[PDB]
């Protein structure tokens, strides 16, 4: 009899409870949301599935072997005190990845094609042909070449965009020019549409700012460069996005993530011209997908196979 | 000395004149818009580039060897009296094709992802997460598997959609289920998003009607099926689109082409929920591309090589 899995996910409690009924069927779960677990013995607990966990969890469960992230980032856990020196496994999923690419490609196309202008004219019953360059005349610069960035690059290339990439260590992608950390300025100067798919770390906090927007390509086929972010909202300075759009440094933006969520009702971003807002719904983590992932990684671990998608603890993602 | 090419293109006269200055440099052109050509001898004329040509053109130029269509359809010439029994060459172009696929993919994604709802909420400063199935759960049925349809199919598949096709004769496309003329009802019943890329012929006039919309899949992942048309506007019955959307037979539409263009200011389509209108700017024919195409086909013909993209005169496209 294997011990039950500890689950402390601070989102959608009724959904977590329901979906747990059919999860971990060989061992069960300990849902930290249940008041009946306030005094529970976690000394045998091997695996913990955590999203914004209680600060004292590691004192209560000192013999954990693996922590599984309960969402698609680890910024919710990576900085907390007393985080044990054991593997932390990211949540990744094929359906999530392909849905991020749908969003990224759609946003890039809407900027390329002038969706804002088309919509504005449509609402006013105005027939107004727009000029748009073909995708090959426009360079999309993808920042982050991980699971999401690699998929987005491939699909943007199929749609015809010129695509370049930037990541901390240069990533080899056949047929795509790729740049490493220190080449940021060179990469920005080549980029017409910036696509942000970075994790949140100290290095990427407040990273998309005024100075960065002013380094994007100014003489490209869209006229003015565009900023897209679906990584983490705390990576951008929203007041600088607003200023950049107003001043013509940016021609537009698409944002799925915000410094504070939900985005404040009074944010200037809602009504800014050529800006598309989605309410952090580009590619959400879902409970069944999460539990299948964790179950699979436990099955691997219990065969003595390596855990997959283990974060780089020193790098923080 | 080869005879000049006859040009009678009833659109953008000043643009045609300007672009002709650098076209056909080994022989020149006869622009039928120039009043100085009212009495011109066309007895030596070999090639004619025509878009909505004068009705008496073939009487004036009785020795033509090839007619080149001056736009990306031939419905503007195919039905006219006295059209000679000589090859009629379509205008086709790689940049046009890839731009149609940008539009098609963008429209399919905007329906998949709920762009209408996202935009509506954004305008009202409302944070409102939407649910959308991944593309693989949705079947796009592409009607027309020619130059445009084949490109759209390939790119929709890369984005993850399930894709099926319909054409007059079944077209073999590796990995895509394809249907022939008589299998229309079966094809419609499998289709969640209909993508129309048909030419205008008698058989396709008034083809997208109430009866057709009621045959689309009703129990699919989008809830209600969607109608997209970027072929020819006279292929659809707009009042039936309006009724179908109002009644919930269609969940939405995207239209680049209309029965009458420009679309009447009072059309109900402009303000219909979940309907996207573009003003026949999905993939326009452009003058330099047209002239390069015609010049190339003349070069082939004068080597004794076959003309490409010759229409099927009996089929009418
Ligand atoms: N909006 C949504 O719904 C949504 C959904 C899922 C995920 N996300 C976010 O998207 C992020 C990315 O996901 P992923 O799976 O693609 O991540 P991943 O596989 O961990 O890849 C991260 C990429 O970012 C790069 N990177 C990290 N720090 C960097 C730095 N300081 N400078 C330059 N590049 C840096 C990495 O460089 P190396 O290749 O050199 O390591 C790597 O290429 C997640 O962490 C999450 O925050 C958002
Ligand atoms: N919105 C725009 O900006 C824009 C731009 C360019 C073109 N267009 C329009 O798009 C059309 C399609 O272009 P294309 O280059 O892809 O054409 P294409 O290469 O001629 O292919 C036409 C396709 O339609 C099919 N078809 C024709 N009549 C049919 C019928 N009665 N039943 C079933 N299928 C039928 C053909 O079947 P088979 O394969 O059996 O022959 C073929 O697959 C053009 O004719 C033009 O009207 C629009
Ligand atoms: Cl602000
Ligand atoms: Cl009507
Ligand atoms: Na500001
Ligand atoms: Na009607």
Short mmCIF file of C-alpha atoms in Angstrom, two decimals, chain A residues 94-95 98-99 101-103 105-106 109-110 112-113 115 118-119 121-123 125-130 132-135 155 158-159 258 261-263 265-267 269-271 275-282 284, chain B residues 94-95 98-99 101-103 105-106 109-110 112-113 115 118-119 121-123 125-130 132-135 155 158-159 258 261-263 265-267 269-271 275-282 284:
data_model
loop_
_atom_site.label_atom_id
_atom_site.label_comp_id
_atom_site.label_asym_id
_atom_site.label_seq_id
_atom_site.Cartn_x
_atom_site.Cartn_y
_atom_site.Cartn_z
CA UNK A 94 0.64 18.62 -24.99
CA UNK A 95 -2.83 20.15 -25.09
CA UNK A 98 -0.75 23.47 -28.68
CA UNK A 99 -3.33 25.91 -27.20
CA UNK A 101 0.50 28.24 -30.03
CA UNK A 102 -3.07 28.84 -31.19
CA UNK A 103 -3.10 32.04 -29.12
CA UNK A 105 -0.31 32.59 -33.91
CA UNK A 106 -3.74 34.21 -33.71
CA UNK A 109 -1.92 37.28 -37.40
CA UNK A 110 -4.33 39.84 -35.95
CA UNK A 112 -0.22 41.47 -39.21
CA UNK A 113 -3.65 41.74 -40.79
CA UNK A 115 -7.79 43.15 -36.97
CA UNK A 118 -11.10 45.89 -39.43
CA UNK A 119 -13.15 45.58 -36.22
CA UNK A 121 -14.60 49.89 -39.23
CA UNK A 122 -17.02 46.96 -39.01
CA UNK A 123 -18.64 48.40 -35.86
CA UNK A 125 -20.51 49.97 -40.92
CA UNK A 126 -17.48 51.23 -42.84
CA UNK A 127 -16.08 49.40 -45.87
CA UNK A 128 -12.34 50.03 -45.67
CA UNK A 129 -9.74 47.89 -47.40
CA UNK A 130 -6.48 47.56 -45.44
CA UNK A 132 -0.94 44.25 -44.91
CA UNK A 133 2.46 42.83 -45.74
CA UNK A 134 2.69 39.04 -46.13
CA UNK A 135 4.01 37.29 -43.05
CA UNK A 155 3.95 27.15 -36.27
CA UNK A 158 4.69 27.42 -41.22
CA UNK A 159 2.36 30.44 -41.43
CA UNK A 258 -0.70 41.25 -16.07
CA UNK A 261 -4.66 39.90 -12.02
CA UNK A 262 -7.50 40.40 -12.55
CA UNK A 263 -6.42 43.48 -14.50
CA UNK A 265 -10.99 47.91 -14.21
CA UNK A 266 -9.37 51.35 -14.58
CA UNK A 267 -6.28 50.10 -16.44
CA UNK A 269 -4.81 48.94 -21.38
CA UNK A 270 -8.50 48.01 -21.91
CA UNK A 271 -9.25 50.89 -24.32
CA UNK A 275 -4.14 46.41 -27.90
CA UNK A 276 -5.75 42.97 -27.40
CA UNK A 277 -6.39 41.75 -23.88
CA UNK A 278 -7.18 38.18 -22.89
CA UNK A 279 -7.89 37.47 -19.21
CA UNK A 280 -5.09 34.95 -18.58
CA UNK A 281 -6.90 32.30 -20.58
CA UNK A 282 -4.34 31.58 -23.33
CA UNK A 284 -4.68 27.40 -18.53
CA UNK B 94 2.51 32.54 -54.26
CA UNK B 95 2.16 35.69 -52.17
CA UNK B 98 -0.01 32.48 -48.54
CA UNK B 99 -2.01 35.64 -47.65
CA UNK B 101 -4.07 31.14 -45.74
CA UNK B 102 -3.19 33.82 -43.18
CA UNK B 103 -6.78 35.07 -43.38
CA UNK B 105 -6.25 30.44 -40.31
CA UNK B 106 -6.81 33.71 -38.44
CA UNK B 109 -8.64 30.66 -34.75
CA UNK B 110 -10.79 33.67 -33.84
CA UNK B 112 -12.14 28.67 -32.00
CA UNK B 113 -10.85 31.00 -29.32
CA UNK B 115 -12.38 36.53 -30.20
CA UNK B 118 -12.97 38.56 -25.72
CA UNK B 119 -13.33 41.82 -27.69
CA UNK B 121 -15.62 42.08 -22.74
CA UNK B 122 -12.44 44.09 -23.36
CA UNK B 123 -14.44 47.08 -24.64
CA UNK B 125 -13.42 46.55 -19.13
CA UNK B 126 -14.66 43.09 -18.14
CA UNK B 127 -12.29 40.31 -17.05
CA UNK B 128 -13.95 37.15 -18.33
CA UNK B 129 -12.13 33.87 -18.90
CA UNK B 130 -13.47 31.86 -21.85
CA UNK B 132 -12.27 26.93 -25.86
CA UNK B 133 -11.64 23.42 -27.12
CA UNK B 134 -8.21 22.72 -28.62
CA UNK B 135 -8.18 22.83 -32.41
CA UNK B 155 -1.72 25.14 -42.50
CA UNK B 158 -0.31 22.24 -38.66
CA UNK B 159 -2.26 24.46 -36.23
CA UNK B 258 -20.48 39.67 -50.58
CA UNK B 261 -19.71 44.93 -52.98
CA UNK B 262 -19.17 47.24 -51.25
CA UNK B 263 -21.46 45.64 -48.68
CA UNK B 265 -24.24 50.19 -45.17
CA UNK B 266 -27.59 48.87 -43.90
CA UNK B 267 -26.64 45.18 -44.14
CA UNK B 269 -24.16 41.51 -41.24
CA UNK B 270 -22.12 44.46 -39.85
CA UNK B 271 -23.56 44.26 -36.31
CA UNK B 275 -19.67 37.73 -37.39
CA UNK B 276 -16.37 39.09 -38.77
CA UNK B 277 -16.43 41.18 -41.92
CA UNK B 278 -13.42 42.04 -44.06
CA UNK B 279 -13.97 44.29 -47.09
CA UNK B 280 -12.75 41.89 -49.79
CA UNK B 281 -9.16 42.36 -48.72
CA UNK B 282 -8.20 38.77 -47.79
CA UNK B 284 -6.20 40.93 -53.45
#
